[PDB]
């Protein structure tokens, strides 16, 4: 069976959020959203991945959170749910990290993503 390993709580994954200054970029099979208003924060990237054979397979959802718990960024598969490679995920994360860091934020990633990184 396909299972799911996530850094996020049920509430964190379900929450609706608005960006103060919306930015949305599509990069291949993945959508990247980030709030252009956010600056000088410590941000943590948290992800939910499907798992098969005890290995991380596809990204279901990634959200970027301030330490206080506010969502400031998101990566999700396109609605067509095209399906993607690990390289697609790594590219989309780099794009999000780049944008956030350009706005003077400090970005770190979860243990789940660290592991995925290689």
Residue numbers in the entry: 86 to 203
Mind quoting what the paper says about this structure?
The NS1 protein of influenza virus is an important virulence factor and has been demonstrated to interact with a wide variety of viral and cellular biomolecules. The effector domain (ED) of the influenza virus virulence factor NS1 is capable of interaction with a variety of cellular and viral targets, although regulation of these events is poorly understood. Furthermore, both domains form homodimers in vitro. While the conformation of the RBD dimer appears to be conserved, two forms of the ED dimer have been proposed: the strand–strand dimer and the helix–helix dimer.
In this paper, we report a third X-ray crystallographic structure of the PR8 NS1 ED containing the W187A mutation. The novel crystal form of PR8 NS1 ED (W187A) shows the α/β fold common to all structures of NS1 ED. The introduction of a W187A mutation into the ED induces a monomeric phenotype and, intriguingly, two crystal structures of the PR8 NS1 ED containing this mutation also exhibit this strand–strand interface. However, it is intriguing to observe that the strand–strand dimer is conserved among all three PR8 NS1 ED (W187A) structures that have now been solved. The partial con­servation of the strand–strand packing interface indicates that while it may not allow ED dimerization, extension of the β-sheet is a possible method of interaction with cellular and viral binding partners.
